[PDB]
Ligand binder design. Structure first.
Ligand SMILES: *[C@@H]1O[C@H](CO)[C@@H](O[C@@H]2O[C@H](CO)[C@@H](O[C@@H]3O[C@H](CO)[C@@H](O)[C@H](O[C@H]4O[C@H](CO)[C@@H](O)[C@H](O)[C@@H]4O)[C@@H]3O)[C@H](O)[C@H]2NC(C)=O)[C@H](O)[C@H]1NC(C)=O
Ligand SMILES: *[C@@H]1O[C@H](CO[C@@H]2O[C@@H](C)[C@@H](O)[C@@H](O)[C@@H]2O)[C@@H](O[C@@H]2O[C@H](CO)[C@@H](O)[C@H](O)[C@H]2NC(C)=O)[C@H](O)[C@H]1NC(C)=O
Ligand SMILES: *[C@@H]1O[C@H](CO[C@@H]2O[C@@H](C)[C@@H](O)[C@@H](O)[C@@H]2O)[C@@H](O)[C@H](O)[C@H]1NC(C)=O
Ligand SMILES: Nc1ncnc2c1ncn2[C@@H]1O[C@H](COP(=O)(O)O)[C@@H](O)[C@H]1O
Ligand SMILES: *[C@@H]1O[C@H](CO)[C@@H](O)[C@H](O)[C@H]1NC(C)=O
Ligand SMILES: *[C@@H]1O[C@H](CO)[C@@H](O)[C@H](O)[C@H]1NC(C)=O
Ligand SMILES: *[C@@H]1O[C@H](CO)[C@@H](O)[C@H](O)[C@H]1NC(C)=O
Ligand SMILES: [Ca+2]
Ligand SMILES: [Zn+2]
Ligand SMILES: [Zn+2]
Length: 777
């Protein structure tokens, strides 16, 4: 029986016959004693040679052992492990399934865009969007550096590419030690230094060898023992590329991944650490099927192709002559030439600033202006010679279900037998800091939003303090003469109609209860504004922008004068007001309403909406979207959801950094005026997850939110709808522009839901939720 003792020279498991065997040259992994004292053991050693119960055969059932002060944290990434693999194949992966059964797992973890390996691994350890950490793709150019970055080049090890602070520096700077067994960035002298221990990347290293060395670091003297370590394997990504995500080959690769994790857990058990180590097992992105039959070619759109293209699932286009022509390159002409060309194009071109704001993909010089958003399972490539089109790939929109990643966790810091809703991989950095009792460097995670995964949360979130309390808008006389140019000939007693805008204290409180049921937004921006109380809606009107910061109203389940009737608001000083004359006839902009007059009961109520403090400058083509949304879509939503609380308002993000900006920054205004033009309009729809309740009697833990950040564009070319005779394209357009409430807050400087009677950390979950339709549609 040589074979079962020729196995050691090629196997990592403690087979039945070799329990006690004689050490020779040379076994990769060693049974049996003296394996233990020599710390040479095959991970199964005790279950297989000592007849102990293996980790796997055990039941689910905070005891770190000798010299383990604080829980070590292990971050284990399996490249390309899509959330779907776990949902359908979990019984083919016994070790991961145990972990899933006994620990804490998410329904899925959302990656960042583009859904690429270096982008997402670096986001995981920094908590940063790619536009901030700087690794915006596996391939990129930087005109300031005038340097190219690639996965097969030594420029990638240049620290100038790598921004932010990876978790291994956060630990090291605060007195801990970090060891990485492969991780993008770990071989770079980021901020001038390396992890405490790190390995030179070698894709050929047996996964088993990677686990055994991670186990040895745990075996180190306490003085040198890492407190944080990473583990990385290339499967199921490698096989997924070659054969696609639905293939026998990928299942084989997933089982090989499953055994990798099995070896790790048995090794922890052996060392009595299984209930000591906190372990996070996750992935950088998912995997999707491609075909040489599903290719879009630039040659079909350009007679002449004088440009450089990053091809595939997340394309960009830039000048071929860089850096001379990097900026003069006409990205707008490229986008226009690619727009609405064939009835069923399988991609859509964008300037980066017009990309859905939820992608946070614009504010970096390396992010070429021309971006293509590609339909799932397709690729956009230069010409018909493109060759890398069989099997699988990734890169797409992080909303696609195939791009979702796994997230499983286990250890004393984590709840047991617990399943949490999906969350974003930007949240994981704060989580790891909490598990290592580290203070996080500034990042894009929302600290505390993942506290429901943890047994005793290390971080307790603080409410944001309002920076700008309201000012007073005083009731006053109609100016005489009235030089607004506004007209509303139907009004018979103007002083009486305007007294409806001057509510008694109990009417204010009633309006507050019905239309601001979660409290008024707090203003974190430095802004001068006042609150306008009305029966059906309340707003914060700001002289800084001559319009509301926000407008809020509640519509119940079940139930259109535009500028036939409009008048100045006597509570707003004229010099701080929009006028009807400000909207001169020769214009592409027309007044839009935040609280829609088509919702108020006919009669005196409707006059409360028809005032110059309830209007926002809208492109006519955007108004078309807006009016269809509030006249047709919104009532249908409200009937389906048993009422809706609606808060809406303008966004100005002219430096496209994803945040509100000082008012000096606005670069566009209504012609001949100083009425600023918003880049986006936000809408936040709140109802009850239990549709037997209304937005007003919902338990706070059961609120349902749907937010939109709608680009304020002068045409509807994004929807290919300017020649469209209907509005059935509006819903689809809005669906790709949903957003987290947290995105709205960042862009507006507003803070919502301050009055909810639940823990702040629960409200943070609500605010980080991303509404997604695309996998339902
Ligand atoms: C995601 O999270 C990251 C991390 O917090 C965050 O990146 C940060 O962005 C802010 C603002 O956009 C940056 O603020 C800068 O701070 C630096 C520090 O070096 C200063 O150099 C800058 O000062 C300028 O702005 C002043 C405005 O008052 C000007 O007066 C002055 O003239 C300067 O031009 C600037 O304030 C911050 O540096 C980064 N941090 C990192 C590490 O990158 C990002 O904004 C978050 N993204 C989203 C969408 O929320
Ligand atoms: C703001 O006005 C510009 C310019 O308006 C044109 O020039 C002005 C001096 C005045 O004479 C107007 O009557 C002219 O139309 C607008 O830019 C125009 O855009 C339209 C497309 O919508 C186009 O047909 C014209 O060529 C453009 N004019 C020029 C000279 O560029 C701009 O659209 C206006 N924006 C707003 C807020 O409506
Ligand atoms: C929806 O709610 C119904 C009413 O239950 C009562 O109100 C809800 C909001 C909860 O607070 C519950 O504690 C109350 O008893 C339920 O009967 C019904 O089951 C709920 N629907 C679902 C799917 O749970
Ligand atoms: N730490 C690393 N250093 C260098 N290259 C890496 C590292 N980790 C992964 N890779 C490579 O990146 C590939 C994944 O890229 P992709 O399939 O394009 O997402 C892997 O198959 C490896 O070839
Ligand atoms: C970067 O690569 C491009 C090709 O995409 C090349 O034209 C350019 O000269 C390169 N620049 C440097 C500094 O290597
Ligand atoms: C770089 O390292 C220095 C020295 O520890 C530290 O003060 C600084 O915060 C680090 N910067 C970043 C971006 O991590
Ligand atoms: C990479 O690892 C393989 C497999 O262990 C080994 O054969 C090879 O020597 C390593 N390559 C380098 C360049 O170190
Ligand atoms: Ca901004
Ligand atoms: Zn990857
Ligand atoms: Zn890949």
């Amino acid at each position: 029986y040589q074979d079962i003792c020729v196995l050691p020279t090629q196997s990592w498991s403690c087979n039945k016959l070799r329990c006690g065997e004689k050490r020779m040259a040379n076994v990769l992994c060693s049974c049996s004693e003296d394996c233990l004292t020599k710390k040479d053991c095959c991970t199964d050693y005790k279950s297989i040679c000592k007849r102990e119960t293996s980790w796997l055969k055990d039941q689910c059932a905070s005891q770190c052992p000798e010299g383990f002060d604080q829980s070590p944290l292990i971050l284990f990434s399996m490249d390309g492990f899509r959330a779907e693999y776990l949902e359908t194949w979990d019984t083919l992966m016994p070790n991961i399934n145990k972990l899933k059964t006994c620990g804490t797992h998410a329904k899925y973890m959302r990656a960042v865009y583009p859904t690429k390996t270096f982008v997402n691994h670096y986001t995981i350890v920094t908590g940063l969007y790619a536009e901030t950490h700087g690794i915006i793709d596996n391939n990129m150019y930087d005109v300031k550096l005038n340097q190219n970055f690639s996965l097969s080049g030594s420029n990638m090890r240049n620290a100038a590419w790598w921004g932010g602070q990876p978790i291994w520096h956060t630990a090291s700077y605060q007195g801990l030690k970090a060891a990485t067994y492969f991780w993008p960035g770990s071989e770079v002298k980021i901020n001038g230094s390396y992890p405490t221990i790190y390995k030179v990347y070698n894709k050929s290293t047996p996964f088993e060898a990677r686990v055994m060395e991670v186990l040895k670091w745990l075996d180190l003297p306490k003085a040198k023992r890492p407190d944080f370590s990473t583990l990385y394997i290339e499967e199921p990504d490698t096989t997924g590329h070659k054969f696609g995500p639905v293939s026998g080959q990928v299942i084989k690769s997933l089982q090989m991944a499953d055994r990798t994790l099995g070896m790790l857990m048995e090794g922890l058990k052996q060392r009595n650490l299984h209930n000591c180590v906190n372990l996070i097992l996750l992935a950088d992105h998912g995997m999707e099927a491609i075909s040489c039959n599903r290719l879009e070619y630039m040659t079909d759109y350009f007679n002449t192709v004088d440009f450089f293209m990053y091809e595939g699932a997340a394309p960009r286009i830039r000048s071929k002559n860089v850096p001379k022509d990097f900026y003069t390159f006409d990205s707008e002409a490229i986008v226009k030439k690619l727009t609405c060309r064939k009835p069923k194009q399988h991609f859509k071109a964008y300037l980066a600033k017009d990309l859905p704001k939820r992608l946070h993909f614009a504010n970096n010089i390396r992010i070429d202006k021309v971006n293509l958003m590609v339909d799932r399972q397709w690729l956009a490539v230069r010409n018909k010679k493109y060759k890398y089109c069989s099997g699988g790939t990734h890169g797409y929109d992080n909303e696609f279900k195939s791009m979702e990643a796994i997230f499983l966790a286990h250890g004393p810091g984590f709840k047991e037998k617990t399943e949490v809703t999906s969350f974003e991989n930007i949240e994981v950095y704060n989580l790891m800091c909490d598990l290592l009792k580290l203070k996080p460097a500034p990042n894009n995670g929302t600290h505390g939003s993942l506290n429901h995964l943890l047994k005793n949360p290390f971080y307790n979130p603080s409410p944001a303090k309002e920076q700008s309390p309201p000012l007073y808008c005083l009731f006053g006389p109609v100016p005489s003469p009235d030089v607004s140019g506004c007209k509303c000939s139907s009004i018979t007693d103007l002083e009486a109609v305007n007294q409806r805008l001057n509510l008694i204290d109990q009417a204010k409180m009633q309006s507050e209860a019905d239309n601001l049921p979660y409290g008024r937004p707090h203003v974190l921006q430095h802004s001068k504004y006042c609150l306008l109380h009305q029966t059906k809606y309340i707003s914060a009107y700001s002289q800084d922008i001559l319009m509301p910061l926000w407008n809020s109203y509640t519509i119940s389940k079940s139930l259109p004068s535009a500028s036939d009737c409009l008048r100045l608001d006597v509570r707003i000083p004229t010099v701080q007001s929009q006028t009807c004359s400000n909207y001169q006839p020769d214009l592409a902009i027309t007044p839009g309403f935040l609280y829609p007059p088509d919702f108020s009961s006919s009669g005196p109520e409707q006059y409360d909406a028809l005032i110059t403090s309830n209007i926002v400058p809208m492109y006519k083509e955007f108004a078309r979207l807006w009016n269809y949304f509030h006249s047709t879509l919104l009532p249908k939503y409200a009937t389906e959801r048993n009422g809706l609380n609606v808060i809406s308002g303008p966004i100005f993000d002219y430096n496209y950094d994803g945040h509100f900006d000082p008012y000096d920054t606005i670069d566009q205004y209504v012609n001949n005026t100083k009425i600023p033009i918003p880049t986006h309009y936000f809408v936040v729809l709140t109802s009850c997850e239990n549709s037997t309740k209304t937005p007003l009697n919902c338990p706070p833990g059961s609120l349902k939110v749907l937010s939109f950040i709608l680009p304020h564009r002068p045409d509807n070319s994004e929807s290919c709808a300017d020649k469209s005779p209907d509005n059935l394209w509006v819903e689809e357009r809005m669906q790709t522009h949903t957003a987290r409430v947290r995105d709205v807050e960042l862009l507006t400087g507003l803070d919502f839901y301050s009055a909810l009677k639940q823990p702040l950390s629960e409200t943070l979950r609500l605010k980080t939720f991303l509404p997604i339709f695309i996998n339902s549609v």
